[PDB]
Amino acid sequence: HMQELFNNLMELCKDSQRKFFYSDDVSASGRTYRIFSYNYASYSDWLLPDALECRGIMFEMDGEKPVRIASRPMEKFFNLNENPFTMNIDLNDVDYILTMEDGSLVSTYLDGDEILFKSKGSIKSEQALMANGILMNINHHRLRDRLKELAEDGFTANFEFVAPTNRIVLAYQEMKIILLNVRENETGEYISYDDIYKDATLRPYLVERYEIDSPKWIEEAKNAENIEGYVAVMKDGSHFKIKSDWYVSLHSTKSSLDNPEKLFKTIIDGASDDLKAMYADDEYSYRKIEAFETTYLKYLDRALFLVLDCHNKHCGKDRKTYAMEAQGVAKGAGMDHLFGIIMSLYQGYDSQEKVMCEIEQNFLKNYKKFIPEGY
Ligand SMILES: Nc1ncnc2c1ncn2[C@@H]1O[C@H](COP(=O)(O)OP(=O)(O)OP(=O)(O)O)[C@@H](O)[C@H]1O
Ligand SMILES: [Mg+2]
Ligand SMILES: [Mg+2]
Numbered sequence: 001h002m003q004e005l006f007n008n009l010m011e012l013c014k015d016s017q018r019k020f021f022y023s024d025d026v027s028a029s030g031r032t033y034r035i036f037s038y039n040y041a042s043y044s045d046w047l048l049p050d051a052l053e054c055r056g057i058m059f060e061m062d063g064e065k066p067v068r069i070a071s072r073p074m075e076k077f078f079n080l081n082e083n084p085f086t087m088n089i090d091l092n093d094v095d096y097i098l099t100m101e102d103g104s105l106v107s108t109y110l111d112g113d114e115i116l117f118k119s120k121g122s123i124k125s126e127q128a129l130m131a132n133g134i135l136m137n138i139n140h141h142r143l144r145d146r147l148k149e150l151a152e153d154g155f156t157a158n159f160e161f162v163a164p165t166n167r168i169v170l171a172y173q174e175m176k177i178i179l180l181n182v183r184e185n186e187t188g189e190y191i192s193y194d195d196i197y198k199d200a201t202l203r204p205y206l207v208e209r210y211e212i213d214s215p216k217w218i219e220e221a222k223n224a225e226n227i228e229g230y231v232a233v234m235k236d237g238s239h240f241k242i243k244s245d246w247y248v249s250l251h252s253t254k255s256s257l258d259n260p261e262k263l264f265k266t267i268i269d270g271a272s273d274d275l276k277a278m279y280a281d282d283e284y285s286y287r288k289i290e291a292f293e294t295t296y297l298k299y300l301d302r303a304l305f306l307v308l309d310c311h312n313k314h315c316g317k318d319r320k321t322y323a324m325e326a327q328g329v330a331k332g333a334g335m336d337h338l339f340g341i342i343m344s345l346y347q348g349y350d351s352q353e354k355v356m357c358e359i360e361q362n363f364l365k366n367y368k369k370f371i372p373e374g375y
């Protein structure tokens with residue numbers, strides 16, 4: 001049911017805004033939406049109830065109660081050999097594979113009588129509004145009416161937004177939206193690729209599919225150049241990704257395994273999941289990355305708690321009472337570098353995201369204090 005999904009996602013959000021989090025927003029027709037998403041999660045974090053569904057799913061809210069799943073992107077999936085979810089997979093259970101397109105995800109949602117796009121985290125991001133500019137284009141009037149019909153029937157269409165101005169690694173020639181899959185808002189079930197393919201209105205947009213005889217396509221993908229990789233579709237409908245070493249080496253900081261600052265940078269930037277998959281063959285490198293990952297996730301939880309708890313208890317007091325309490329919390333937690341963080345909050349507290357940026361940047365200034373013991 002919808003409400004137990006909502007309540008389980010809400011549950012995930014009490015832990016830490018480091019981890020799973022939600023954010024409210026209002027569309028141009030004036031109604032509220034809630035997007036559930038995440039910043040950093042570990043393998044144990046992904047085992048909690050419905051955590052794999054907490055990757056951009058959106059509800060329209062009447063205050064605290066949800067009224068409908070307005071949008072439903074793909075479940076979280078991982079690189080092969082990234083963690084136990086993907087480490088003892090029988091490659092013979094692969095049904096087929098899909099070009100992995102290298103842009104930003106956009107998913108449909110119905111707002112009023114309007115069919116619109118949300119990027120993974122927002123209804124108002126630049127990719128979101130750019131994708132809407134495409135949908136409103138007369139040259140996509142026949143795609144848009146189909147997507148509009150799907151959402152009133154409770155299906156979300158998921159595309160990669162790619163463009164010269166949305167460069168990640170791959171250089172596309174032109175700005176487009178590439179339909180990757182369509183999913184049912186209530187069940188999480190997907191319309192089959194073949195069903196989408198034989199709709200000749202949708203087919204022009206649809207990501208390319210390939211057949212495989214046998215798992216040598218894996219190493220060919222790992223060794224290819226000028227591709228991100230492929231998304232594998234299993235006989236049971238689940239997915240995993242496979243990236244080329246070429247993509248991962250450009251998507252990670254250079255020399256990431258030779259330098260602890262660069263490894264922490266890669267982790268902070270959210271690319272250590274692909275790096276460690278790339279180094280799954282090398283148990284020293286894989287477990288080193290994981291140790292740095294654990295260190296930083298553990299620190300971020302601590303730092304965030306201490307900073308936000310301290311700010312919300314003493315916000316508004318005279319500056320040196322506030323300083324006294326900030327002094328206490330930073331010295332008391334063996335984290336004196338946090339004092340400046342807390343005092344930066346004192347004049348102004350915009351988003352809780354800018355707090356994470358300051359914690360994150362500070363961490364990279366003091367990274368040597370934090371290299372896990374033994375490395
Ligand atoms: N054929 C495809 N099928 C599904 N997703 C695709 C496909 N091609 C590109 N993508 C994109 O791949 C994304 C997931 O893989 P990617 O490595 O880009 O994730 P990410 O942005 O690093 O997020 P995370 O690692 O947290 O899952 C999807 O959200 C989607 O935008
Ligand atoms: Mg991507
Ligand atoms: Mg990733």
